[PDB]
Amino acid sequence: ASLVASIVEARKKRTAKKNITPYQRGIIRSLILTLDCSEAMLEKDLRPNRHAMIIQYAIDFVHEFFDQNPISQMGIIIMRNGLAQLVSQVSGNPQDHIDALKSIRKQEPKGNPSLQNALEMARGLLLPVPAHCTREVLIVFGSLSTTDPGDIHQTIDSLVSEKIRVKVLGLSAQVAICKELCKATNYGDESFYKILLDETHLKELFNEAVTPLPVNKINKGFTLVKMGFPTRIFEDTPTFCSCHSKLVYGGYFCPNCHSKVCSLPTVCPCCDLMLILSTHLARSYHHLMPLKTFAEVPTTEKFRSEDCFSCQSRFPILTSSRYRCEDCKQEFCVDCDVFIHEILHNCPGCESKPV
Amino acid sequence: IKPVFERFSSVIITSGTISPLDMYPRMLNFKTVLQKSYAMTLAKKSFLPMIITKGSDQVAISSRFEIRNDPSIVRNYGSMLVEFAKITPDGMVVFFPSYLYMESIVSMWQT
Amino acid sequence: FIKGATISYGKVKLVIKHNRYFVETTQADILQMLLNDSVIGVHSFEIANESVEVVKKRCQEIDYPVLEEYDFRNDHRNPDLDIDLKPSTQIRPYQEKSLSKMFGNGRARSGIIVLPCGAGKTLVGITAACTIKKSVIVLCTSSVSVMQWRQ
Numbered sequence: 001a002s003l004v005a006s007i008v009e010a011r012k013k014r015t016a017k018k019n020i021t022p023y024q025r026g027i028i029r030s031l032i033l034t035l036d037c038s039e040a041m042l043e044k045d046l047r048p049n050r051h052a053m054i055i056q057y058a059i060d061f062v063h064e065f066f067d068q069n070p071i072s073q074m075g076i077i078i079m080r081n082g083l084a085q086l087v088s089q090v091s092g093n094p095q096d097h098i099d100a101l102k103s104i105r106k107q108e109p110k111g112n113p114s115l116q117n118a119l120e121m122a123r124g125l126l127l128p129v130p131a132h133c134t135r136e137v138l139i140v141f142g143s144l145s146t147t148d149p150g151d152i153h154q155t156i157d158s159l160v161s162e163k164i165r166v167k168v169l170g171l172s173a174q175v176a177i178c179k180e181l182c183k184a185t186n187y188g189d190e191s192f193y194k195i196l197l198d199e200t201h202l203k204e205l206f207n208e209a210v211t212p213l214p215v216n217k218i219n220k221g222f223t224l225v226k227m228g229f230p231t232r233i234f235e236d237t238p239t240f241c242s243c244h245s246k247l248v249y250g251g252y253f254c255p256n257c258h259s260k261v262c263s264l265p266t267v268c269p270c271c272d273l274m275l276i277l278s279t280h281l282a283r284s285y286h287h288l289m290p291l292k293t294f295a296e297v298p299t300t301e302k303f304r305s306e307d308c309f310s311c312q313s314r315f316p317i318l319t320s321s322r323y324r325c326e327d328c329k330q331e332f333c334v335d336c337d338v339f340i341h342e343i344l345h346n347c348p349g350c351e352s353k354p355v
Numbered sequence: 356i357k358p359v360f361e362r363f364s365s366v367i368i369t370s371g372t373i374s375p376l377d378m379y380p381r382m383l384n385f386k387t388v389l390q391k392s393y394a395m396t397l398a399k400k401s402f403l404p405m406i407i408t409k410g411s412d413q414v415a416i417s418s419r420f421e422i423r424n425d426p427s428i429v430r431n432y433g434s435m436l437v438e439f440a441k442i443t444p445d446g447m448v449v450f451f452p453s454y455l456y457m458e459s460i461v462s463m464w465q466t
Numbered sequence: 467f468i469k470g471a472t473i474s475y476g477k478v479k480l481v482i483k484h485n486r487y488f489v490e491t492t493q494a495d496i497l498q499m500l501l502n503d504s505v506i507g508v509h510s511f512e513i514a515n516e517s518v519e520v521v522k523k524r525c526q527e528i529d530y531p532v533l534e535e536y537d538f539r540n541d542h543r544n545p546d547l548d549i550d551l552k553p554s555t556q557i558r559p560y561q562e563k564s565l566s567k568m569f570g571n572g573r574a575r576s577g578i579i580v581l582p583c584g585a586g587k588t589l590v591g592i593t594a595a596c597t598i599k600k601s602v603i604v605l606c607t608s609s610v611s612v613m614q615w616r617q
């Protein structure tokens with residue numbers, strides 16, 4: 001009954017994932033990572049520490065976000081001891097955020113939360129943010145209480161006016177205030193306020209949270225952006241960079257002012273334009289067109305092939321692990337189907353199928 | 356309620372946690388043509404009742420009017436109070452049989 | 467080895483009828499095997515009460531072991547010492563198991579318990595006395611330790 005339970009749990013997961021839709025999602029993103037050094041995360045119920053796995057899993061999320069969404073920029077606000085602090089603003093450089101993260105790892109967490117203060121300076125940080133740059137904040141919380149210098153509802157309405165969507169990730173259980181926050185922040189949706197159950201589910205929550213979010217019609221931002229690629233030149237001399245003014249062997253040229261910069265994806269510092277490459281924009285085409293799930297055929301029918309169409313391994317008999325792409329009508333094994341849906345972004349069976 | 360009975364035929368009686376039913380036609384000289392009870396056909400249980408007869412120290416607990424001022428059992432009770440105070444997300448209520456006894460225990464607790 | 471480790475349990479029983487060791491048996495069936503041994507001197511008889519210590523060894527080689535499992539509640543003659551404890555004391559589960567060792571039947575099985583130092587062995591003995599509830603005395607070859615366990 002183990003395979004039957006696995007099949008019915010996969011059916012529940014498939015019922016959750018039936019809504020495969022090509023929604024327009026948040027691409028030009030601006031993120032704020034609200035963190036807390038409070039005394040609640042000192043508890044050794046988590047091994048070695050709540051703050052410990054917060055540190056490593058935050059580093060992992062930084063890497064995953066800079067990979068999956070390179071063109072976006074993310075900031076870090078730290079809560080500690082009655083007043084929140086800023087350690088990393090929004091940047092295309094993950095190195096600064098990583099150095100701040102390991103500085104927080106070196107230091108000790110202690111304090112008590114002021115979520116109104118955190119939200120207020122987060123509002124100040126997202127204040128000079130362009131309209132196409134979507135404003136989103138991630139929230140972690142290890143407690144059940146927060147004192148604040150003033151009322152929170154004016155802040156709530158003001159941030160709703162600032163057109164923001166926010167996910168909140170609590171530690172213990174659901175809190176009505178945070179539920180209301182995600183509700184009003186996310187147009188009545190309360191799927192944005194989720195609580196973990198263990199570290200595996202926690203990491204799964206991170207892996208979900210790296211992904212972009214679909215956007216609505218009513219908050220329409222249909223416009224154009226003035227983009228331009230730089231030209232990398234492998235130069236023969238140590239040369240000054242525009243930003244840090246240090247001598248570099250080679251690098252890029254600005255498409256307009258011909259200045260050089262250390263890294264991509266970054267804006268120009270001089271004529272002030274976003275300079276990316278084709279990798280950054282190609283990174284989300286699998287968002288732009290998704291990959292619909294593959295038809296797991298039953299063992300009752302006769303099959304076109306009894307071995308895998310892709311990895312070329314023989315199919316088993318009690319259950320039929322022959323998973324057929326509807327866009328290609330070729331059955332594949334569970335291993336290849338899971339790997340293609342998690343990594344790959346084209347069906348070789350559909351490459352075989354002529355159109 | 357007797358003039359209510361002889362004044363109105365369609366006298367219909369309901370409540371939430373009236374269990375059992377039989378002593379109410381005893382305490383009130385009446386009868387019903389029919390009476391039963393209803394329990395919900397809920398999907399999964401979301402109210403969680405359990406009976407605690409002992410603290411984490413495994414000490415028997417009671418609120419009798421004689422042993423109400425027993426400081427060891429008081430300390431056990433406040434250990435429970437501490438442990439729900441650490442974990443309460445939104446709201447939590449405690450009742451006692453007698454308000455004087457509440458004021459006594461809360462007075463010495465604050466003390 | 468286990469099969470040969472089968473004894474005449476419940477078959478020999480010494481009772482102290484007010485400082486008088488009456489060595490009963492549960493049946494006259496035990497008496498026929500016992501009379502084969504002649505070191506000595508339902509059915510009891512005269513034994514030198516100091517010689518009981520040696521004839522317990524003797525019955526260990528002749529494999530009919532006596533048991534000591536006190537029916538204090540059925541011994542109404544000895545005055546009970548009904549003394550309890552406070553609820554603030556906490557018995558650890560190994561102490562609870564130790565209390566279950568001589569109380570598999572509720573009759574006070576006599577034996578040996580050795581525990582590590584500082585394990586509240588005094589408290590375990592106090593609990594054992596408070597559940598035995600009869601006249602009882604405490605012995606130890608010292609003075610300062612004895613008065614401090616009195617304390």
Ligand SMILES: [Zn+2]
Nearest residue numbers: 241243244262
């Ligand atoms: Zn530079």
Ligand SMILES: [Zn+2]
Nearest residue numbers: 254257268271
């Ligand atoms: Zn430029």
Ligand SMILES: [Zn+2]
Nearest residue numbers: 308311333336
């Ligand atoms: Zn395969």
Ligand SMILES: [Zn+2]
Nearest residue numbers: 325328347350
């Ligand atoms: Zn296909």
